[PDB]
Design a protein around this ligand. Structure first.
Ligand SMILES: C[S@@+](CC[C@H](N)C(=O)[O-])C[C@H]1O[C@@H](n2cnc3c(N)ncnc32)[C@H](O)[C@@H]1O
Ligand SMILES: C[S@@+](CC[C@H](N)C(=O)[O-])C[C@H]1O[C@@H](n2cnc3c(N)ncnc32)[C@H](O)[C@@H]1O
Ligand SMILES: C[S@@+](CC[C@H](N)C(=O)[O-])C[C@H]1O[C@@H](n2cnc3c(N)ncnc32)[C@H](O)[C@@H]1O
Lengths: 501, 501, 501
């Protein structure tokens, strides 16, 4: 037994149960255990039972046994023989610890898994040898399917910047081996004696949100804020669904090359604005409660209430008849309340609304709640953006896309009587353009003058021009798109020449 | 004789004179005759003499003889021998019928023709064998030159959707074999016992309009409404000239694939509007009389007076000095009369006008006479379109093409005193913008204020912007055109790869 | 001696000293001398000493000796032998004439030169044989480096349109062999007995301005009026620096193919306007004096004072903080004075200004001093152009390039209080829009109303639209540029096919 232990070749781990060889070969080992433990406990409590564990690359089966010691089933895998023998023997020493173990190569043992066979897999300082053998492209799929078959995988990756030969083969950033998955958070990081460049400790999943505290599953997930949002935020923002919750996860740091100052800073700013607003807000609304908020080294995480109903942008996208009025009424009521307080929401656009059987329209993305000044992103000085939004709301007119979306400002196309409402607001001087005014005008809009008549001169002229402008922008988009497509195809051909040479 | 008749191989036709073999082999034969007869009679009366006839593919010379029986010269052609022998004999039975006949292959007998040798050619159930032998591309030229050498050709084409082997070679639409010619109308159609898919009966010409009643020659013809109109109407609209008449011919149905609902419907709507207007119109104009109107299954035909003078668009296109004023005066006078009645013409554009030695401008295309509402196609609410038109009229400024033509709205560039006229109209509220007002202002425009002075602010600003806008549209057109050209060239290259593979 | 002279083969020149062979072989020779002399004298006086001379291709050393006779050092070069022998002997006849001479081929004798070894080189009827041997591409460099190593080169070129065989090899325009250099002026031209097509006489330099009278060196030189001016003037306009002077040189005639009527005429018009203005101008400014003005057959030359300080466009281009106000004050003061006189400057744009420690802004390019009417090139009726210019002045906003530069018209973005100044001007009717008004408003602008408040309606709307417009133009520029680049690359490929065939 003792003899078989030394027969062992390179004691990477601590042998579990006796401390006599802790002095000889090793790495720290015991700390990593502590964090994994924390994670296990939190996870298990959250679903409501003990868990199945996969110690992919276990060596001396240290981690397995230490987990099995707390009511866990482990099937530890280390392809080389001696490491397994001794750890299976270590398994027998403490009979109550349900751990199986076997010799075999991880790649194929992963292949042979089930959608929910295991709840947890461990990949501590193991894959860097695999990727050296196979390649980045290969390994990525293993891990991706590993997240799919389990429910949460924790890994410790060796970075390319290490002395050992294999280093050169692995990716400059170990984060490249995980990105393909849904959730990933930096739960830890450890320094190596090899070089002053430490190896990180990541946490993944393809079914659940795995925060410090909030460990709940999601239904669907993505990478963009809304339908037709694009690349606007450099693939950095992540959005997770949930039956009763919704999650935001912005990264402050990205693989390879980077979110420039402004982007990183702004999504940092955005979150910190949101959390500081949602906790301690004004009076007179039905705003969602903070379900979970928190920050990490490179990553900033937020979770809130999955408030009811669904988005307008997608409604208009289809055409589900929405009562034009009701949404506006509620929005204005709250909006007024806000204008009163001294706050403001700059992005008054149709991608920020909710609808139910009462159509009580409430906003989303409270990171746009700008306190001090009106401004928006485009139509300067709010009220105009609101006009656009109103045109965007009514709509039923072609499909205009000007980068700086979309519909005409001004009511004249708007049917009667809103037509009139807005012309009345319009007449007035800009200094009086506060939302308090609008709502009031909004309310007694039925008694307002004919609008469409008092126009003539200018005001007709510009209607004709506003329609011309969107068509122009609208086309520029398409020919610009043709141009961008060729820019993309031209890169390929430049590369191709080198391949052909 | 009788013996030679049966010696004959396959009695496709009825032998002419005796009814004894009408029972044996056949196709109906006698009906087709009746329609051809009608057509001959109408044609002959219209020019004022009997006619030369070409029975291309005659078989038993039935049709020839039946035509020769009414004072016609026929040179019937059937390449195979037996069919000719018997029909020449049938020719001799009735000596007074001037018909020659000979054995030879149609293709070469067509080649040997003269510009006005024949007045009529018959191609009843014959070419489908030719196109099987040669091909669609080939046959098209035969027919095209056949229309050129004669004066009217009637054909009966076998459609590709027929059981017989040759079917597969012919075009899915038999209308593809004729389109290259000037005039074509569906004069009939016949069902075949082969399959429940009938073979049509078309009527062509490259010199004359061949209506039911109106059978008059034209000088020149085309496919587009005006110089620089484009593909806007899917090659469906045809326009025929004439020394004293003008013709319109819109198709409700096209070869291969199709005028979508809107296009078919709109050109149907356009005609039906025109005929319903020109007959029973308002008071106070010099409008043209209906020379001929009528409808067919797939085709809608209209003919009216070739009213005098010539178009303005082409005048401006060159530069023939037109008295700026006179045209406007008359146009307004009638226009006013119309506004008064309750009617309206929406397309107040320079492609719709006439000019003589008195410049009494009158419109064209009475399918744009929209009764109820002002609107136009672009510059909304007429009066503005009129402004554009006035700028379009004066002009002498570069060459602006914005899709939504072209010139600035507003008079400020317009020289004095119209400058003033329009600023005065402009000042006024839009609700008062009726043509009745304009004419009156038009008349006393000499006594109007300085216009160009009272501007300042806005009104200058927008002048500068209006000039910018056309330049922008104007360029977008060209780079858009470059883009469309590459889209066209790219298709070719995609195809090319398949050819090269 | 006399015997050696006839031993000579072809007496192209006159033998210097005796007139006995002037009758036999020759070309005129003596006239060319007279012009070269003039040039030498003027040059020498201007630097303040006698000069070193290179008689590249000298034949009978006539010109050399004639120059050496006036205190010049000559190293005459004629590759063929006999011509040198006799001219070295002619050199010895008049011992006081410092001339060396040697046999060798010009190309290599040029190679062996120094930056300031010689002050003058002569290339009279010599290179056409070289270019026949080598080629246009080759010869151009010889001459280019010849201008660099000397300080002024005069040449007489044989044009391609000559009977002699070599003609076919030389360029259709002999001006093609010089253009690469900095300065070139047509100082003369001579008819040849060969054909009624004369050979010209050009004067070059790469260090100095070589006018009739003004023979001063420059520091730097170019081809475009300012940073980012482009090809706008067909490579015809040349601009020469100087420690105390500045030079303009516009060509009325260009190599190959040509400055069309308008371009030639306009740069002729531009100069003649300038000289007629700068001499006999209005009162109330600090305008520069004419240092030298004059005209030539194909070339129009002007030189004026290098007035102090530097350009604004390049200041803004970098960002050297300029006192927003001071420049405006002075400009307006003079501008007012001008408006008063009855004159005007149409191109009120930031590429036409100067700055010092007092920022007393004064204009440049007095060829834009249009007397009678306001107009500019774009923003019609001056005052608006001034608005643009003011926006262009303040700036600090992105980088807008609309062809018709650039910034918004109108003050509303302009900070306070100019904001107000311009709204006040704006309010007023256009007929009152003279600069006299503006300055006065400019002065008491501190006491003006709030501007930014009284807006509302329209005036806000158009602010939003003005920003949209520049972005649109701004993009059109880039995609237009992509398009133009492909137009350029496509030409190459069309050519390539012919090369590949
Ligand atoms: C360095 S250890 C770390 C073990 C454990 N994850 C830890 O951190 O305590 C990695 C172990 O996995 C094994 N291993 C490496 N590549 C493997 C593969 N493709 N399949 C199975 N085991 C592998 C090695 O034998 C080695 O003992
Ligand atoms: C089916 S028939 C119809 C005859 C006649 N057009 C009618 O409908 O009563 C066609 C006849 O034209 C002849 N034919 C076919 N191809 C021909 C060609 N290329 N040249 C001359 N005759 C041809 C055939 O022999 C056949 O008898
Ligand atoms: C026609 S002459 C003119 C001489 C002198 N430039 C003049 O105009 O009085 C040109 C002379 O230069 C010589 N020459 C031609 N090509 C030359 C070369 N590549 N190098 C040196 N000398 C050359 C010829 O021998 C000839 O005598």
């Amino acid at each position: 037994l003792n003899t078989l232990v030394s027969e062992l070749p390179e004691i990477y781990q601590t042998i579990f149960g006796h401390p006599e060889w802790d002095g000889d070969a090793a790495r720290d080992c015991n700390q990593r255990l502590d964090l994994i433990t924390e994670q296990y406990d939190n996870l298990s409590r959250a679903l409501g039972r003990p868990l199945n564990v996969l110690d992919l690359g276990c060596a001396q089966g240290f981690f397995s046994l230490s987990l099995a010691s707390k009511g866990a089933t482990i099937v530890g895998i280390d392809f080389q023989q001696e490491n397994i023998n001794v750890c299976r023997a270590l398994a027998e020493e403490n009979p109550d610890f349900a751990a199986e173990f076997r010799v075999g190569r991880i790649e194929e043992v992963i292949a042979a898994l089930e959608e929910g066979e295991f709840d947890l897999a461990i990949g501590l300082s193991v894959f860097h040898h695999i990727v050296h053998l196979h390649g980045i492209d290969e390994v990525k799929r293993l891990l991706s399917r590993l997240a799919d078959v389990t429910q949460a995988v924790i890994l410790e990756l060796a970075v390319k910047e290490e002395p050992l030969y294999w280093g050169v083969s692995q990716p400059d950033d170990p984060r490249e081996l995980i990105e393909q998955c849904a959730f990933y958070r930096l739960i830890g990081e450890f320094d190596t004696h090899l070089s002053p460049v430490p190896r990180p400790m990541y946490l993944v999943s393809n079914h659940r949100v795995l925060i410090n505290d909030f460990n709940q599953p999601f239904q669907h997930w993505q990478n963009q804020p809304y339908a037709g949002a694009g690349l606007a935020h450099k693939r950095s923002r992540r959005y997770f669904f949930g039956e009763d919750y919704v999650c935001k996860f912005f990264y402050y740091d990205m693989p390879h090359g980077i979110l420039t100052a402004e982007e990183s800073q702004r999504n940092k700013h955005e979150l910190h604005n949101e959390i500081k607003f949602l906790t301690q807000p004004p009076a007179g609304f039905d705003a969602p409660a903070v379900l979970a908020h928190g920050e990490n080294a490179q990553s900033g995480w937020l979770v809130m209430e999955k408030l009811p109903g669904r988005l307008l942008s997608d409604m208009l996208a289809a055409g589900e008849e929405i009562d034009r009025e009701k949404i506006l009424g509620s929005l204005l009521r709250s909006l007024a309340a806000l204008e009163k307080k001294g706050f403001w929401h700059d992005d008054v656009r149709p991608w920020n609304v909710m609808v139910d059987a009462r159509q009580h329209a409430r906003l989303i993305d409270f990171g746009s709640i700008v306190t001090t000044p009106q401004d928006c992103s485009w139509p300067t000085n709010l009220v105009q953006s609101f006009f656009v939004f109103v045109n965007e709301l009514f709509a039923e007119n072609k499909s205009w896309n000007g980068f700086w979306r979309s519909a005409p400002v001004h009511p004249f196309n708007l049917p009667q009587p809103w037509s009139n409402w807005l012309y009345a607001v319009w007449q007035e001087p800009v200094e009086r353009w506060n939302f308090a005014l609008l709502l009031a005008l909004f309310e007694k809009k039925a008694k307002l003058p004919s609008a469409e008549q008092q126009r003539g001169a200018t005001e007709q002229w510009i209607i004709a021009q506003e329609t011309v402008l969107l068509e122009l922008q609208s086309r520029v988009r398409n020919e610009s798109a043709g141009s961008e497509a060729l820019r993309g195809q031209i890169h390929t051909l430049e590369q191709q020449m080198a391949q052909l040479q």
